[PDB]
Amino acid sequence: SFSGYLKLTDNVYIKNADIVEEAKKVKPTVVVNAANVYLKHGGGVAGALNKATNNAMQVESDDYIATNGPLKVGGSCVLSGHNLAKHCLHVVGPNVNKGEDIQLLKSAYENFNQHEVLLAPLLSAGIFGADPIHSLRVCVDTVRTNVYLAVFDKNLYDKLVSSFL
Numbered sequence: 001s002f003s004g005y006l007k008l009t010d011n012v013y014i015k016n017a018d019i020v021e022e023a024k025k026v027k028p029t030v031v032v033n034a035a036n037v038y039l040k041h042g043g044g045v046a047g048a049l050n051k052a053t054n055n056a057m058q059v060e061s062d063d064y065i066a067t068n069g070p071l072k073v074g075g076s077c078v079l080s081g082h083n084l085a086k087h088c089l090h091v092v093g094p095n096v097n098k099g100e101d102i103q104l105l106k107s108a109y110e111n112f113n114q115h116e117v118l119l120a121p122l123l124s125a126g127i128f129g130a131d132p133i134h135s136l137r138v139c140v141d142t143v144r145t146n147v148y149l150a151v152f153d154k155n156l157y158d159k160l161v162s163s164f165l
Protein backbone atom coordinates (compact mmCIF):
# COMPACT_ATOMS: atom_id res chain seq x y z
CA SER A 1 0.00 0.00 0.00
CA PHE A 2 1.03 3.72 0.47
CA SER A 3 4.30 4.15 2.38
CA GLY A 4 6.35 7.07 3.69
CA TYR A 5 3.42 9.46 4.13
CA LEU A 6 3.15 12.06 6.86
CA LYS A 7 -0.33 12.04 8.47
CA LEU A 8 -1.85 15.54 8.48
CA THR A 9 -5.38 14.70 9.68
CA ASP A 10 -7.69 11.62 10.26
CA ASN A 11 -7.89 11.17 6.45
CA VAL A 12 -5.25 13.33 4.73
CA TYR A 13 -1.66 12.13 4.19
CA ILE A 14 1.22 13.82 2.35
CA LYS A 15 4.53 12.77 0.78
CA ASN A 16 7.27 14.46 -1.25
CA ALA A 17 6.96 12.27 -4.32
CA ASP A 18 6.50 12.23 -8.06
CA ILE A 19 2.83 11.18 -8.47
CA VAL A 20 3.72 9.14 -11.64
CA GLU A 21 6.38 7.16 -9.73
CA GLU A 22 4.02 6.86 -6.79
CA ALA A 23 1.22 5.56 -9.09
CA LYS A 24 3.56 3.03 -10.83
CA LYS A 25 4.63 1.79 -7.33
CA VAL A 26 1.30 1.76 -5.43
CA LYS A 27 -1.02 1.03 -8.49
CA PRO A 28 -3.88 2.70 -6.45
CA THR A 29 -7.54 2.17 -7.24
CA VAL A 30 -7.73 5.91 -8.09
CA VAL A 31 -5.11 8.37 -9.21
CA VAL A 32 -6.31 11.97 -9.52
CA ASN A 33 -5.28 14.01 -12.52
CA ALA A 34 -5.03 17.81 -12.38
CA ALA A 35 -7.10 18.11 -15.54
CA ASN A 36 -8.44 21.03 -17.58
CA VAL A 37 -12.01 21.13 -19.01
CA TYR A 38 -10.79 19.86 -22.40
CA LEU A 39 -8.78 16.96 -20.93
CA LYS A 40 -5.77 18.28 -22.89
CA HIS A 41 -2.94 16.77 -20.82
CA GLY A 42 -0.13 19.03 -21.98
CA GLY A 43 1.86 19.98 -18.92
CA GLY A 44 2.16 19.79 -15.15
CA VAL A 45 0.77 16.67 -13.49
CA ALA A 46 -1.55 15.97 -16.49
CA GLY A 47 1.29 16.02 -18.99
CA ALA A 48 3.39 13.77 -16.76
CA LEU A 49 0.58 11.22 -16.14
CA ASN A 50 -0.31 11.18 -19.83
CA LYS A 51 3.34 10.70 -20.90
CA ALA A 52 3.56 7.72 -18.46
CA THR A 53 0.58 6.10 -20.26
CA ASN A 54 2.40 6.47 -23.66
CA ASN A 55 -0.42 8.95 -24.64
CA ALA A 56 -3.18 6.35 -24.06
CA MET A 57 -4.74 8.72 -21.50
CA GLN A 58 -4.94 11.50 -24.14
CA VAL A 59 -6.45 9.15 -26.77
CA GLU A 60 -9.11 7.99 -24.31
CA SER A 61 -9.70 11.61 -23.18
CA ASP A 62 -10.21 12.90 -26.73
CA ASP A 63 -12.84 10.20 -27.32
CA TYR A 64 -14.51 11.19 -23.99
CA ILE A 65 -14.58 14.89 -25.03
CA ALA A 66 -15.84 14.07 -28.54
CA THR A 67 -18.78 12.22 -26.93
CA ASN A 68 -19.50 14.37 -23.88
CA GLY A 69 -18.10 17.83 -24.42
CA PRO A 70 -15.89 19.63 -21.92
CA LEU A 71 -16.02 19.21 -18.18
CA LYS A 72 -17.05 22.08 -15.91
CA VAL A 73 -14.39 23.90 -13.81
CA GLY A 74 -14.89 22.18 -10.43
CA GLY A 75 -16.08 18.97 -12.11
CA SER A 76 -14.62 15.58 -12.83
CA CYS A 77 -14.89 12.38 -14.78
CA VAL A 78 -13.69 8.84 -14.14
CA LEU A 79 -11.63 7.30 -16.91
CA SER A 80 -9.12 4.40 -17.05
CA GLY A 81 -5.99 4.58 -14.94
CA HIS A 82 -4.09 2.75 -17.73
CA ASN A 83 -0.72 1.46 -16.34
CA LEU A 84 -0.90 3.84 -13.33
CA ALA A 85 -4.09 2.98 -11.45
CA LYS A 86 -7.42 1.10 -11.85
CA HIS A 87 -9.08 4.51 -12.55
CA CYS A 88 -8.05 8.06 -13.16
CA LEU A 89 -10.30 10.68 -11.65
CA HIS A 90 -9.77 13.76 -13.86
CA VAL A 91 -10.59 16.71 -11.65
CA VAL A 92 -10.68 20.32 -12.90
CA GLY A 93 -9.53 22.79 -10.31
CA PRO A 94 -9.79 26.52 -11.20
CA ASN A 95 -6.79 27.83 -13.14
CA VAL A 96 -6.11 31.27 -11.62
CA ASN A 97 -3.65 31.91 -14.55
CA LYS A 98 -6.83 31.71 -16.81
CA GLY A 99 -8.72 34.04 -14.36
CA GLU A 100 -11.00 31.27 -13.00
CA ASP A 101 -12.93 31.49 -9.71
CA ILE A 102 -10.71 30.27 -6.84
CA GLN A 103 -13.98 29.61 -4.88
CA LEU A 104 -14.42 26.59 -7.31
CA LEU A 105 -11.49 24.78 -5.61
CA LYS A 106 -13.82 23.46 -2.86
CA SER A 107 -16.22 22.08 -5.54
CA ALA A 108 -13.23 20.45 -7.25
CA TYR A 109 -12.13 18.71 -4.02
CA GLU A 110 -15.70 17.49 -3.37
CA ASN A 111 -15.23 15.08 -6.29
CA PHE A 112 -12.71 13.17 -4.13
CA ASN A 113 -15.51 12.24 -1.69
CA GLN A 114 -16.97 9.82 -4.24
CA HIS A 115 -13.88 7.55 -3.80
CA GLU A 116 -12.84 5.72 -0.60
CA VAL A 117 -9.10 6.21 -1.21
CA LEU A 118 -7.15 8.30 -3.74
CA LEU A 119 -3.60 9.16 -4.71
CA ALA A 120 -3.74 12.88 -5.67
CA PRO A 121 -1.90 16.08 -6.34
CA LEU A 122 -2.87 19.43 -4.72
CA LEU A 123 -5.60 20.84 -6.97
CA SER A 124 -4.99 24.19 -8.70
CA ALA A 125 -1.35 24.16 -7.47
CA GLY A 126 1.69 24.32 -9.83
CA ILE A 127 0.94 25.66 -13.30
CA PHE A 128 -2.74 26.25 -12.27
CA GLY A 129 -1.52 29.26 -10.25
CA ALA A 130 -3.23 28.90 -6.88
CA ASP A 131 -1.39 29.06 -3.56
CA PRO A 132 -0.61 25.40 -2.65
CA ILE A 133 -0.93 26.23 1.09
CA HIS A 134 -4.51 27.37 0.35
CA SER A 135 -5.11 24.20 -1.74
CA LEU A 136 -3.99 21.94 1.12
CA ARG A 137 -6.28 23.81 3.55
CA VAL A 138 -9.27 23.40 1.19
CA CYS A 139 -8.35 19.72 0.75
CA VAL A 140 -8.28 18.99 4.50
CA ASP A 141 -11.51 20.97 5.07
CA THR A 142 -13.39 19.36 2.13
CA VAL A 143 -12.23 15.80 1.56
CA ARG A 144 -13.57 13.21 4.01
CA THR A 145 -12.28 10.11 2.20
CA ASN A 146 -8.63 8.91 2.46
CA VAL A 147 -6.40 11.12 0.31
CA TYR A 148 -2.66 10.52 -0.20
CA LEU A 149 -1.19 13.73 -1.54
CA ALA A 150 1.97 13.57 -3.63
CA VAL A 151 3.87 16.91 -3.74
CA PHE A 152 6.65 16.82 -6.35
CA ASP A 153 8.63 19.85 -5.17
CA LYS A 154 10.71 19.13 -1.91
CA ASN A 155 10.91 22.81 -0.98
CA LEU A 156 7.14 23.20 -1.41
CA TYR A 157 6.54 19.93 0.54
CA ASP A 158 8.64 21.27 3.47
CA LYS A 159 6.80 24.61 3.37
CA LEU A 160 3.40 22.83 3.32
CA VAL A 161 4.24 20.58 6.29
CA SER A 162 5.95 23.32 8.35
CA SER A 163 3.06 25.78 7.86
CA PHE A 164 0.19 23.23 8.27
CA LEU A 165 -2.20 24.34 10.94
Ligand SMILES: Cn1cc(C(=O)Nc2ccc(O)cc2)cn1
Nearest residue numbers: 125126127129130131132153156
Ligand atom coordinates in the same frame (compact mmCIF):
# COMPACT_ATOMS: atom_id res chain seq x y z
C1 LIG B 1 6.77 24.52 -7.68
N1 LIG B 1 5.66 25.34 -7.20
C2 LIG B 1 5.73 26.44 -6.44
C3 LIG B 1 4.45 26.92 -6.30
C4 LIG B 1 4.08 28.17 -5.55
O1 LIG B 1 4.85 28.64 -4.71
N2 LIG B 1 2.89 28.71 -5.92
C5 LIG B 1 2.27 29.88 -5.43
C6 LIG B 1 1.31 30.55 -6.19
C7 LIG B 1 0.61 31.61 -5.65
C8 LIG B 1 0.85 32.02 -4.36
O2 LIG B 1 0.12 33.02 -3.79
C9 LIG B 1 1.83 31.39 -3.60
C10 LIG B 1 2.53 30.32 -4.14
C11 LIG B 1 3.66 26.01 -7.02
N3 LIG B 1 4.39 25.06 -7.58
